[PDB]
Every structure is written in structure tokens, then in C-alpha cells.
Ligand binder design. Structure first.
Ligand SMILES: CC(C)[C@@H]1[N@@H+](Cc2ccc3c(NC[C@]4(O)CCCN(c5cc(NCc6ccccc6)ncn5)C4)cccc3c2)CC12CCC2
Lengths: 196, 243
């Protein structure tokens, strides 16, 4: 079901097996640098979400190493690294040793994904800063050109992240909004009274 | 404006459109008065006992020749790099700047830093513009076109941004932007500075350069250690010389 969908929840405790498989998974976690400890990030049930495809994992500070850990533990090989160069409205650029002009997003592959449009975009994003902690909308266009029309899931999204073809999970979303019939089916079976 | 869509349209990388890409002058002069005479030494570093290089260093810049720098052109594998005994010539408090490329080096280079005992504090990015040439041949694993390189910064023991924007060098030109040197010297980390896998073209005041392709050598360990004997043992490299 093509339009936006979302589930307010605690991603620690949601039975993500109800959601099916996704060509792309994206995660912008609140790293302990309402955060999660490092053992809670390792234990997240990412491995069930995909059989073949890509993972996009934002990192910062020491999660640069730790996100490589989760990425490998969850069954991925890191194959690329996107960086976003933060500018203002006039295209000039905005860690205790150097000032930070960028955010990092690891790209991980699992299994053998086929029919993806590898090579279309390049690993640098240049785009204006929006709110605090607010990732740029350009990543969705890159992710749609890479794998058009497939199902995608975002972990730790906020309301502004909800996108067509995407299912957003995060604890600041407004309720449960699900339209894919299989997902609605497995969701009512596992959660008959709608409490997680 | 979506510069990623624009790059998909026109072949102009998003970094092509970054614009613009004090007392800093005085610090640069103090660095320049502080600098040791440049010293350099041809050495096949695979075959070379690293421990001959003394004294222990405050900064190590490590620029191994990755096979990926030769797209259309002796390369070192991360296997070879990881076996270097970098920790034997590093001071107990010291810094490393390791050029990792854009592939598996982003992971393997982190393993080295831990193997030699450093923690990573900065990830410095060389973003390469293609203003003078709106095509790439992809690594099989690659998902996106690779338009940047990473220089990882490491610390062991107790002004500038983390981006370098320059135009993509000509095919088969493997030089790294000399801006990495300014970022290092501005940290004021001490004066024993080693550049492994430098070339004739990278020799520089304030630095010792060791590489297989150097055509001349002037390195003498006793002369080199003379530059830092008292009263000069602990200078940051950013202070006035002691009389
Ligand atoms: C480069 C990256 C790394 C950088 N990110 C940093 C970032 C990312 C997301 C931010 C955010 N996301 C919205 C949330 O819902 C808010 C709350 C926590 N969280 C959870 C947690 C959870 N379980 C634990 C739990 C529950 C209840 C009580 C305690 C613990 N279950 C569902 N959601 C996400 C909100 C505010 C700031 C964020 C900052 C951003 C970038 C990209 C640009 C920089």
C-alpha cells in the first residue's frame, strides 16, 4: 500500500516480525553518546527485517565505531558511507579537535540484492539544515532512485519522516496508521487490543 | 534545490555548489619559525625495520599506496598496512592521520588505529569536485559513486573544519591535498612529525618523510634528535623558539 504508514511504539519491544521484509532499512538512532544503551542497540531485531537489500545507518561520534559493530552483528557488510555537508540558505558550510561540517550515514548490504540501480547517486549530500537532529529529505530521493517502488522501513523516525512506500517507527509519532492489508492482518493477530 | 537530483540530471556532483570552498596568520608564522629543517629518507618500508626511526614521534601521517588510487593505472593491501609496527615508533601521547580511501579502508583503517593503540577522534573528509568534468567506474560492492576520501585522526594517551574541498585530481595523480598538512600543523601537537609513504613532492619543513620512491636522503637519527634536545623537548610547534 503506497501511502505513508507509521507505528508509534518502543522499537525495543515491538514484534517487528509482523512487518514483513524490506528492500531498504533506514535507522537514525538516538545513540548514547530518550536514548538506548549500547546493548539495546545490539539486541534490536534488525536481522528479521530483510533478506536481501540495504541498510542506511546514521552515526556520529563514537557510534561511528559502534554503528559498524551493530551493522556487522546484524548481518551486514558496510559497502558505502554517505556524508551530508551541512550548509545554510546561501550554500556555505556551517569532536573537540575540529569543527564538524558533516553527518555520516553508513550503507550496509545484506544477502544479494538484485535489480537495484547502483551508481545513480554519489556519496555526498549538500543541503540546508532544518530543525535540530533533522536529516535531509534528499536521502529519500536517493533511496527511491536506488530501489524504486519497493517497501522501506525507517527506525526512530519522527512525524516529518513519513514518506510514501515507507513505514516509520518511532515513539513521537501520532498513533498507528497502517494500510498494507498483510501488515494490518499480522498486526491485529499479534496485537488484538492494540497495545504493545 | 535538490543537488542529488541535479547530479543525477547533469553529472555535477553536489559539492560543486558549495561556496567559499585574521590572527590565523600569526600562528602560521610561529609554526614556520618552529619548523625543523625538512628531513627525508628513501626506505622500502615493507623491508625496513621501523624501529630505526627515532625518536618516538608526536604526529604520524600515514599515506600507504592503496590499489584503489590506481583506477586507470607496488600497491599496499590493508594486510600489509595492518602489519606495520606503528606503535613501536609512536610517543605515548601522539596522534596519527591515516588516509583510508573510500572502500574497505574505512573499516580496516579503524582496525589498524586500534591495533596500534589509538582511538579515533576525527574523520576528515576530502570531498572531490568535478567542476571541470561533469563519469565514474564503480567498485563492484559500491552502491553510490564515490567522490571523496577519508583521513582518520587518532589519539593515544592523555579553528579548522573536518572537510577539505578540492577538484578531483587528474587520473593517476595520487597526491593528497596539501590542506591536510595545514590542519595538522594548526593542532600544535609537537614537533616530531613523521610522514610515511611521502614522496619527493611532499617533503616539507617541520616534517620527516620516509618512502620507497624518495630519490635523495638526508636522514641522520642523531642530527634529527638534535633538533629536539633540551631546551626544545616539549614545544608545541606553535610557540616562539627558546633562546
Ligand atoms: C547522525 C545521526 C546519528 C544524528 N541523529 C541523531 C538523532 C536521531 C533521532 C532523534 C529523535 N528521534 C525521535 C525519537 O522517537 C525520539 C525519542 C527516542 N527515539 C526512540 C526510542 C525508542 N526506545 C527507547 C526509549 C523509549 C521511551 C523512553 C526512553 C528510551 N523507541 C522509538 N523511538 C527516537 C528525537 C530527538 C533528537 C534525535 C537526534 C540525527 C542525526 C541525523 C542528523 C543528525
Amino acid at each position: 500500500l503506497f501511502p505513508p504508514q507509521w507505528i508509534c511504539c518502543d522499537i525495543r519491544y515491538l514484534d517487528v516480525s509482523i512487518l514483513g521484509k524490506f528492500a531498504v532499512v533506514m535507522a537514525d538512532p538516538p545513540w548514547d553518546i530518550g536514548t538506548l544503551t549500547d546493548d539495546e542497540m545490539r539486541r534490536l531485531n534488525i536481522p528479521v527485517l530483510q533478506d536481501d537489500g540495504f541498510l542506511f545507518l546514521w552515526v556520529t561520534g563514537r557510534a561511528m565505531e559502534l554503528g559498524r559493530e551493530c551493522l556487522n552483528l546484524w548481518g551486514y557488510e558496510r559497502v558505502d558511507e554517505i556524508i551530508w555537508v551541512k550548509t545554510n540558505q546561501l550554500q556555505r558550510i556551517i569532536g573537540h579537535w575540529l569543527n564538524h561540517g558533516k553527518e555520516h550515514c553508513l550503507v550496509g548490504v545484506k544477502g544479494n540484492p538484485q535489480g537495484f540501480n547502483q551508481g545513480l547517486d554519489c556519496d555526498v549530500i549538500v543541503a540546508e539544515v532544518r530543525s535540530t537532529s533533522h536529516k535531509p529529505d534528499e536521502i529519500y530521493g536517493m533511496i527511491e532512485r536506488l530501489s524504486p517502488g519497493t517497501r522501506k522501513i525507517e527506525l526512530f523516525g519522527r512525524p516529518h519522516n513519513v514518506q510514501p512506500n515507507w513505514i516509520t517507527l518511532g515513539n513521537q509519532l501520532d498513533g498507528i496508521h497502517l494500510l498494507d492489508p498483510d501488515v494490518v492482518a499480522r498486526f491485529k493477530q499479534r496485537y488484538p487490543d492494540g497495545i504493545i | 534545490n535538490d543537488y542529488c537530483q541535479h547530479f543525477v540530471d547533469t553529472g555535477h556532483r553536489p559539492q560543486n555548489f558549495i561556496r567559499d570552498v585574521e590572527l590565523i596568520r600569526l600562528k602560521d608564522e610561529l609554526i614556520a619559525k618552529s619548523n625543523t629543517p625538512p628531513m627525508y629518507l628513501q626506505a622500502d618500508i615493507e623491508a625496513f625495520d621501523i624501529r630505526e626511526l627515532t625518536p618516538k614521534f608526536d604526529v604520524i601521517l600515514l599515506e600507504p599506496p592503496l590499489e584503489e588510487y590506481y583506477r586507470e593505472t607496488k600497491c599496499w593491501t590493508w594486510d600489509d598496512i595492518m602489519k606495520l609496527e606503528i606503535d613501536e615508533i609512536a610517543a605515548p601521547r601522539s596522534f596519527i592521520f591515516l588516509w583510508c580511501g573510500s572502500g574497505e579502508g574505512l573499516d580496516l583503517g579503524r582496525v589498524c588505529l586500534r591495533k596500534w593503540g589509538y582511538r579515533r577522534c576525527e574523520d576528515i573528509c576530502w570531498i572531490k569536485t568535478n567542476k571541470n568534468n561533469p563519469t565514474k567506474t564503480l567498485d563492484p560492492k559500491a552502491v553510490f559513486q564515490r567522490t571523496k576520501e577519508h583521513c582518520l585522526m587518532g589519539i593515544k594517551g592523555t579553528v579548522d573544519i573536518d572537510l577539505i574541498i578540492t577538484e578531483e585530481p587528474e587520473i593517476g595523480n595520487i597526491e593528497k591535498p596539501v590542506e591536510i598538512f595545514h590542519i595538522i600543523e594548526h593542532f600544535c601537537l609537537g614537533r616530531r612529525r613523521l610522514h610515511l609513504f611521502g614522496r619527493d613532492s611532499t617533503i616539507r619543513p617541520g616534517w620527516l618523510t620516509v618512502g620507497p620512491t624518495l630519490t635523495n636522503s638526508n636522514y641522520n637519527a642523531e642530527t634529527y634528535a638534535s633538533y629536539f634536545s633540551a631546551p626544545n623537548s616539549y614545544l608545541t610547534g606553535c610557540t616562539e623558539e627558546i633562546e
